[PDB]
Scaffold this motif. Structure first.
Motif, PDB file in Angstrom:
ATOM      1  N   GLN B 318       0.813  -1.203   0.000  1.00  6.38           N
ATOM      2  CA  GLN B 318       0.000   0.000   0.000  1.00  6.38           C
ATOM      3  C   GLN B 318       0.861   1.273   0.000  1.00  6.38           C
ATOM      4  O   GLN B 318       0.661   2.190  -0.787  1.00  6.38           O
ATOM      5  CB  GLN B 318      -0.870  -0.036   1.278  1.00  6.38           C
ATOM      6  CG  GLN B 318      -1.767  -1.253   1.353  1.00  6.38           C
ATOM      7  CD  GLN B 318      -2.928  -1.322   2.321  1.00  6.38           C
ATOM      8  OE1 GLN B 318      -3.366  -2.398   2.767  1.00  6.38           O
ATOM      9  NE2 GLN B 318      -3.500  -0.142   2.637  1.00  6.38           N
ATOM     10  N   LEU B 319       1.916   1.259   0.827  1.00  8.71           N
ATOM     11  CA  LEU B 319       2.907   2.324   0.868  1.00  8.71           C
ATOM     12  C   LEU B 319       3.489   2.529  -0.533  1.00  8.71           C
ATOM     13  O   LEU B 319       3.424   3.670  -0.976  1.00  8.71           O
ATOM     14  CB  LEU B 319       4.092   2.061   1.809  1.00  8.71           C
ATOM     15  CG  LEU B 319       3.766   2.083   3.291  1.00  8.71           C
ATOM     16  CD1 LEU B 319       5.025   1.743   4.065  1.00  8.71           C
ATOM     17  CD2 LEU B 319       3.182   3.394   3.745  1.00  8.71           C
ATOM     18  N   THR B 322       0.822   4.201  -3.013  1.00  7.01           N
ATOM     19  CA  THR B 322       0.753   5.632  -2.751  1.00  7.01           C
ATOM     20  C   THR B 322       1.897   6.341  -3.482  1.00  7.01           C
ATOM     21  O   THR B 322       1.670   7.257  -4.263  1.00  7.01           O
ATOM     22  CB  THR B 322       0.919   5.856  -1.230  1.00  7.01           C
ATOM     23  OG1 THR B 322      -0.042   5.058  -0.534  1.00  7.01           O
ATOM     24  CG2 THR B 322       0.663   7.294  -0.832  1.00  7.01           C
ATOM     25  N   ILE B 346       7.407   8.965   3.932  1.00  6.35           N
ATOM     26  CA  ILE B 346       7.647   7.541   3.704  1.00  6.35           C
ATOM     27  C   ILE B 346       9.066   7.254   3.223  1.00  6.35           C
ATOM     28  O   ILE B 346       9.797   6.418   3.825  1.00  6.35           O
ATOM     29  CB  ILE B 346       6.595   7.006   2.687  1.00  6.35           C
ATOM     30  CG1 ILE B 346       5.202   7.003   3.321  1.00  6.35           C
ATOM     31  CG2 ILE B 346       6.976   5.625   2.162  1.00  6.35           C
ATOM     32  CD1 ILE B 346       4.017   6.865   2.370  1.00  6.35           C
ATOM     33  N   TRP B 431       6.289   1.170   7.871  1.00  5.41           N
ATOM     34  CA  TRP B 431       4.856   1.025   8.222  1.00  5.41           C
ATOM     35  C   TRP B 431       4.630   1.091   9.725  1.00  5.41           C
ATOM     36  O   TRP B 431       3.730   1.786  10.189  1.00  5.41           O
ATOM     37  CB  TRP B 431       4.243  -0.265   7.691  1.00  5.41           C
ATOM     38  CG  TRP B 431       2.830  -0.446   8.169  1.00  5.41           C
ATOM     39  CD1 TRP B 431       2.426  -1.253   9.213  1.00  5.41           C
ATOM     40  CD2 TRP B 431       1.654   0.219   7.685  1.00  5.41           C
ATOM     41  NE1 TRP B 431       1.072  -1.144   9.358  1.00  5.41           N
ATOM     42  CE2 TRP B 431       0.573  -0.276   8.423  1.00  5.41           C
ATOM     43  CE3 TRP B 431       1.411   1.143   6.677  1.00  5.41           C
ATOM     44  CZ2 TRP B 431      -0.731   0.155   8.218  1.00  5.41           C
ATOM     45  CZ3 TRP B 431       0.123   1.578   6.462  1.00  5.41           C
ATOM     46  CH2 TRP B 431      -0.942   1.096   7.246  1.00  5.41           C
ATOM     47  N   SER B 435       2.478   4.378  11.007  1.00  2.00           N
ATOM     48  CA  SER B 435       1.105   3.972  11.317  1.00  2.00           C
ATOM     49  C   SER B 435       0.853   4.239  12.800  1.00  2.00           C
ATOM     50  O   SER B 435      -0.226   4.671  13.158  1.00  2.00           O
ATOM     51  CB  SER B 435       0.744   2.519  10.955  1.00  2.00           C
ATOM     52  OG  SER B 435       1.436   1.599  11.796  1.00  2.00           O
ATOM     53  N   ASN B 440      -3.912   3.875  10.403  1.00  6.22           N
ATOM     54  CA  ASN B 440      -3.907   2.930   9.311  1.00  6.22           C
ATOM     55  C   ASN B 440      -4.492   3.470   8.026  1.00  6.22           C
ATOM     56  O   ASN B 440      -4.147   3.020   6.918  1.00  6.22           O
ATOM     57  CB  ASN B 440      -4.549   1.616   9.759  1.00  6.22           C
ATOM     58  CG  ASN B 440      -3.886   0.967  10.955  1.00  6.22           C
ATOM     59  OD1 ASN B 440      -2.671   0.951  11.145  1.00  6.22           O
ATOM     60  ND2 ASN B 440      -4.661   0.428  11.891  1.00  6.22           N
ATOM     61  N   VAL B 442      -4.008   5.626   5.284  1.00  2.00           N
ATOM     62  CA  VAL B 442      -2.988   6.341   4.556  1.00  2.00           C
ATOM     63  C   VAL B 442      -3.436   7.641   3.895  1.00  2.00           C
ATOM     64  O   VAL B 442      -2.696   8.632   3.820  1.00  2.00           O
ATOM     65  CB  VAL B 442      -2.305   5.447   3.519  1.00  2.00           C
ATOM     66  CG1 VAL B 442      -1.249   6.234   2.753  1.00  2.00           C
ATOM     67  CG2 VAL B 442      -1.629   4.292   4.224  1.00  2.00           C
ATOM     68  N   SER B 443      -4.684   7.686   3.468  1.00  2.39           N
ATOM     69  CA  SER B 443      -5.324   8.765   2.782  1.00  2.39           C
ATOM     70  C   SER B 443      -5.660   9.973   3.648  1.00  2.39           C
ATOM     71  O   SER B 443      -6.054  10.996   3.093  1.00  2.39           O
ATOM     72  CB  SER B 443      -6.665   8.211   2.205  1.00  2.39           C
ATOM     73  OG  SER B 443      -6.336   7.352   1.135  1.00  2.39           O
ATOM     74  N   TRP B 445      -3.486  10.795   6.046  1.00  5.21           N
ATOM     75  CA  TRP B 445      -2.206  11.166   6.654  1.00  5.21           C
ATOM     76  C   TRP B 445      -1.808  12.600   6.280  1.00  5.21           C
ATOM     77  O   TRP B 445      -1.709  12.905   5.102  1.00  5.21           O
ATOM     78  CB  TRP B 445      -1.055  10.261   6.213  1.00  5.21           C
ATOM     79  CG  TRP B 445      -0.967   8.901   6.804  1.00  5.21           C
ATOM     80  CD1 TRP B 445      -1.947   8.279   7.541  1.00  5.21           C
ATOM     81  CD2 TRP B 445       0.101   7.954   6.679  1.00  5.21           C
ATOM     82  NE1 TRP B 445      -1.505   7.042   7.905  1.00  5.21           N
ATOM     83  CE2 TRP B 445      -0.288   6.789   7.366  1.00  5.21           C
ATOM     84  CE3 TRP B 445       1.345   7.961   6.032  1.00  5.21           C
ATOM     85  CZ2 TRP B 445       0.520   5.657   7.477  1.00  5.21           C
ATOM     86  CZ3 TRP B 445       2.142   6.841   6.140  1.00  5.21           C
ATOM     87  CH2 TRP B 445       1.742   5.701   6.863  1.00  5.21           C
TER      88      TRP B 445
END
Ligand SMILES: O=C(O)Cc1ccc(O)c(O)c1
Ligand SMILES: [Ca+2]
Lengths: 206, 557
Positions: B318-319, B322, B346, B431, B435, B440, B442-443, B445
């Motif tokens: 997922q990271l 993005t 990240i 992560w 996190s 959790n 990500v959107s 953040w």
């Protein structure tokens, strides 16, 4: 008129100097500098010569000693002594034009002294050519063109030789701090030219 | 510091465009000083650091010029052989030579005065001495003895009218500096200036040499050796303190390298994207490069390959998705304090974990701390200079290239493990760290943006203004301390040249004793933040037309 200096400032306050000879032209430049940036220029002067502790005290004594150990003032005065009269005019005109405004400032301080001189408690002094040259030498040369870490590299190399042995410690040193890297992106394309010298990368001098 | 110069064949609506962003940090009052000089052979307009006599950035209506830092190796260290008996002496070419020395007294406001001695040999001042070995180290500069002539070469070049006259002045500037040229007919050029030593065979310029005689330089290399190009085949010249040319060796600094990972690539792809550019497009490269994350392009391929066999619900994957959706341009949210996408946070935690598992592990303490920085380190005031790719990250980039890298991997930095296993472990570390702080989703953040501070202390750490004179700008921009653009033979004007610049906070630093601030103390500060610019005037009619005030002096030498 040979003696006339005309100063026109634009809508952003930018000065344009009109004069007929070298000394007049740079006297005008120094004069507007003293008008616009006198406290900045004076702390730049003390920074490049290592005279900050005189006005700011004990916290700057190591700084002043480091500035003084990194240059040789008599070698700079010798270079100023060898200039032709035209070149020397550039520097002398600029210091004189500054002095002219500093004279007015020290005569009418209620209205012309930059606030920070009161805040820090000291007053401007007159400049000579040596001081104008040291503005450039203390920033551009003595700082931005003086970079080396050869003594720290040697100590890194010695610690890598202990870790991995003599030959292997040298090869890891070359991995970490290579001399050149053929895939680095270059401002000049390879079709135009490449550097012609090749260097020793083994520390052959020991 | 960066520069791009666009010639005849790449330019549209002009024959030449030059954009320059010298990067020295950000100060109040302004690092550079605007000034026009008309008389005695001079007819120039521009701005320059500390109001030097010579203008480092500007033009004279026929040609234009600008600089960036050179970083060649022009300094070496000489290990001088001392003697326990006959102190103040050193061995040189078979005889015991006496040192130069001078006494210094440091006066101290509200303290006692301090006196010390400075020592110098034929090689230069003494940096440090090792009493145990009886070695003194002397720093030797290739430009020593030519400081004053370099300053005058920067002044006389303002009168040049062509390549030939300009390079005559370039050959006298002795410091390691890149110099750039443009002219009214659309010619463009570059010279990596300075004096570089002519070293004895076997001298490895990264480490010290014995000062006893045999390792002494032979002299200085001629100007024909200095890397230079005139009217390049490509049609443009770009630089961001990267290498001048193939095989040219860089400064000996352990933290500085010219490798396959370099930030000038970011400029190159913008200039190669379009067949021709206008002035407005050449200015606009300042806005893109200012906001570009510099590690994304480098490590995105490696991250993609490692997470390619992962399921959709694996957070390491997922990271990377993005990152795959992101173009790398940072943009502030509406709050003025956080970035719109979390990409740079990240990469920062990933890279810190990757270096601690690779490069740092291979280097003995305490030198390992030289290779751990990710390149994102700052404080609340923001970066003190440009953002670059860290040295650990440049070394790491060569290692993830495998046998596609020309640098021999003497130690495997991945210590026997498959690449992907080390990249997935660092992605797990990433992560876990992020996190825990953000959650959790990500959107949602919202990660902290870098800001920009115009400091009251100068680059040495010395006050040049009162502390309340510090200025803050919400968005950190990876760009010149000042920016200036010169356009030659505009098809849109009758004028042969057009030029612009921005000197922030403003032309003046003056504050009266009553606290009244000059009128030009901060009228360029908002212009800086919005990517705007003011006109630079050259001709008498343009100066008279925009005049706000006039002062005439009558003086006789
Ligand atoms: O890029 C830097 O790091 C410093 C530097 C030195 C000389 C220059 O002309 C310049 O523009 C910038
Ligand atoms: Ca060196």
């Amino acid at each position: 008129s040979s003696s006339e200096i005309k100063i026109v400032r634009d809508e952003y306050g930018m000065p344009h100097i009109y004069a007929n000879d070298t000394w007049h032209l740079f006297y005008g430049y120094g004069y507007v500098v003293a008008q616009d940036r006198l406290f900045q220029m004076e702390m730049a002067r003390r920074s490049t010569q290592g005279t900050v502790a005189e006005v700011l005290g004990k916290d700057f004594v190591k700084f002043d000693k480091d500035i003084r150990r990194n240059y040789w003032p008599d070698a700079i005065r010798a270079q100023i002594a060898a200039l032709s009269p035209e070149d020397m005019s550039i520097l002398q005109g600029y210091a004189d034009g500054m002095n002219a405004w500093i004279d007015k400032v020290n005569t009418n301080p209620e209205t012309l002294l930059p606030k920070q001189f009161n805040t820090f408690g000291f007053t401007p002094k007159r400049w000579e050519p040596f001081d104008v040259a040291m503005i450039f030498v203390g920033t551009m040369a003595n700082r931005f063109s003086d970079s080396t870490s050869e003594i720290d590299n040697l100590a890194l190399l010695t610690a890598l030789k202990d870790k991995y042995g003599v030959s292997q410690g040298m090869a890891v040193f070359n991995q970490l701090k290579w001399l050149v890297n053929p895939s680095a992106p270059t401002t000049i394309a390879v079709q135009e030219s490449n550097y012609p010298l090749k260097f020793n990368q083994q520390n052959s001098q020991t | 510091s960066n520069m791009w110069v666009i010639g005849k064949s790449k330019a549209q609506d002009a024959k030449a465009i030059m954009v320059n962003g010298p990067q020295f940090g950000w100060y109040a009052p302004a690092y550079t000083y605007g000034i026009g000089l008309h008389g005695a052979g001079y007819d120039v307009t521009g701005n320059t650091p500390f109001a030097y006599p010579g203008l480092v950035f500007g033009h004279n209506g026929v040609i234009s010029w600008g600089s960036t830092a050179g970083f060649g190796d022009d300094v070496d260290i000489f290990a001088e052989r001392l003697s326990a008996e006959k102190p103040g002496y050193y061995l040189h070419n078979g005889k015991w030579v006496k040192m130069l020395s001078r006494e210094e007294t440091i006066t101290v406001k509200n303290g006692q005065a301090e006196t010390f001695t400075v020592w110098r040999t034929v090689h230069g001042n003494i940096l440090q001495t090792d009493q145990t070995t009886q070695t003194a180290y002397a720093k030797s500069r290739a430009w020593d003895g030519k400081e004053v002539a370099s300053l005058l070469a920067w002044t006389h070049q303002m009168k040049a009218k062509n390549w030939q006259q300009w390079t005559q002045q370039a050959a006298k500037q002795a410091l390691t500096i890149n110099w750039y040229y443009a002219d009214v007919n659309g010619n463009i050029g570059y010279v990596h200036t300075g004096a570089y030593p002519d070293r004895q065979s076997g001298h490895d310029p990264r480490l010290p040499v014995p000062g006893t005689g045999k390792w002494d330089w032979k002299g200085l290399l001629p100007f024909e050796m200095n890397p230079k190009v005139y009217n390049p085949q490509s049609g443009y010249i770009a630089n961001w303190n990267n290498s001048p040319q193939k095989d040219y060796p860089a400064s000996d600094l352990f933290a500085f390298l010219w490798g396959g990972a370099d930030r000038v690539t970011e400029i190159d792809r913008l200039l190669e994207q379009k067949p021709r550019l206008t002035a407005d497009q050449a200015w606009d490269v300042i806005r893109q490069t200012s906001r570009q994350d510099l590690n994304l392009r480098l490590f995105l391929p490696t991250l993609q390959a490692a997470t390619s066999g992962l399921t959709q619900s694996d957070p390491r994957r997922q990271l990377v998705e993005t990152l795959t959706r992101w173009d790398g341009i940072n943009l502030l949210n509406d709050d003025g304090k956080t970035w719109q996408q979390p990409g740079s946070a990240i990469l920062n935690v990933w890279l810190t974990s990757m270096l601690k598992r690779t490069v740092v592990a291979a280097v003995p303490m305490p030198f390992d701390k030289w290779y751990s920085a990710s390149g994102y380190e700052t404080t609340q005031d923001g970066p003190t200079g440009s953002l670059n790719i860290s040295v650990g990250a440049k070394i790491l980039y060569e290692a993830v290239q495998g046998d596609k890298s020309p640098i021999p991997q003497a130690v495997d930095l991945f210590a026997g493990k498959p690449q992907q296993e080390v990249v997935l472990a660092a992605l797990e570390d990433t992560w876990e760290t992020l996190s825990k702080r953000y959650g959790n989703n990500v959107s949602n953040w919202k990660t902290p943006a870098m800001a920009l501070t115009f400091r009251a202390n100068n680059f040495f750490g010395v006050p040049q203004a009162a502390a309340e004179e510090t200025r803050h700008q919400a968005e950190y921009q990876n760009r010149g301390t000042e920016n200036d653009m010169i356009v030659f033979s505009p098809t849109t004007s009758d004028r042969p040249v057009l030029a612009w610049d921005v000197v922030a906070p403003g032309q003046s630093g003056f504050i009266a004793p009553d606290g009244t601030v000059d009128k030009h103390y901060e009228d360029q500060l908002k212009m800086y933040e919005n990517f705007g610019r003011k006109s630079l005037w050259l001709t008498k009619q343009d100066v008279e037309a925009h005049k706000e005030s006039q002062e005439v002096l009558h003086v006789q030498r």
